[PDB]
Amino acid sequence: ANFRHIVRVAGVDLDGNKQLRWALTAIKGIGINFATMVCRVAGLDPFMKAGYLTDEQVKKIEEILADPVAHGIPRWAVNRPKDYETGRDLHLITAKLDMAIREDIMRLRRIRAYRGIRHELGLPVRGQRTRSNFRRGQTVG
């Protein structure tokens, strides 16, 4: 069949010499596990080389990524198991993912939570000890 060296799926150029599993991981918001789940849902061989994918298979991948829950992927494998506003189970990739993370951080800062303060100051947010580690600056004195 026709072998494409570079294949673009969802705005990201996928490699041609790599298996579909690790090729799909080049998209932000998709790891190896989610890529394997998407391939199994689509019925594609996870071990096939990316590049042999046809247009119909690409569109199937696009629609699966658009609606993962409705396509058989479990509700506990999505990026946002419960959206703050809609309350639905959504999976976001790339620009949507960065926008959602930024919106959550901005909401914390707006409500003036402790996590928001820590995010603003750049200090660790998950209750770590800062006396001996997390040293980003240079030596003083």
Partner RNA sequence: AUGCCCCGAAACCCCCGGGCUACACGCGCGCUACAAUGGGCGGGACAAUGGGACCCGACCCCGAAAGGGGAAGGGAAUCCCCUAAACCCGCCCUCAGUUCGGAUCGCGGGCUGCAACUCGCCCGCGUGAAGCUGGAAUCCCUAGUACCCGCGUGUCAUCAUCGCGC
Per rule CB under 7 A, is residue 65 in the interface with RNA?
no
Phi-psi region of 40 (alpha: psi -120 to 50; beta: other; left: phi over 0): alpha
Nearest residue to 62 via CA among 83, 78, 41, 81: 41
> In this chain, which of 25, 39, 44, 65 binds RNA, going by CB under 7 A?
25
What is the number of other CB atoms lying within 10 angstroms of the CB of residue 18?
15
* Interacting span for RNA (CB under 7 A) from 2-10, 50-58, 59-67, 72-80: 72-80
Using CB distances below 5 to 8 A depending on partner kind, what does residue 109 bind out of another protein, RNA, none? Answer: none
74 binds RNA (CB under 7 A): yes
- The residue (of 4 and 49) whose beta carbon lies closer to another protein is 49
125/131 Cα distance (integer angstroms): 14
Q: For another protein, which is the closer residue by CB, 25 or 93?
A: 25
Q: Is 36 helix (H, G, I), strand (E, B) or coil?
A: helix
- State the minimum distance, in angstroms, from the CB of residue 37 to another protein: 5
Buried b (16+ CB within 10 A) or exposed e, 108-120: beeeeeeebeebe
C-beta of 2 vs 47, nearer to another protein: 47
Q: Residues, the chain, total? A: 141
- Footprint on this chain of RNA (rule: CB under 7 A): 18-19, 22, 25, 27-35, 47, 74, 76-84, 91, 97, 100-101, 104-105, 108, 114-115, 119, 121, 123-132, 134-141
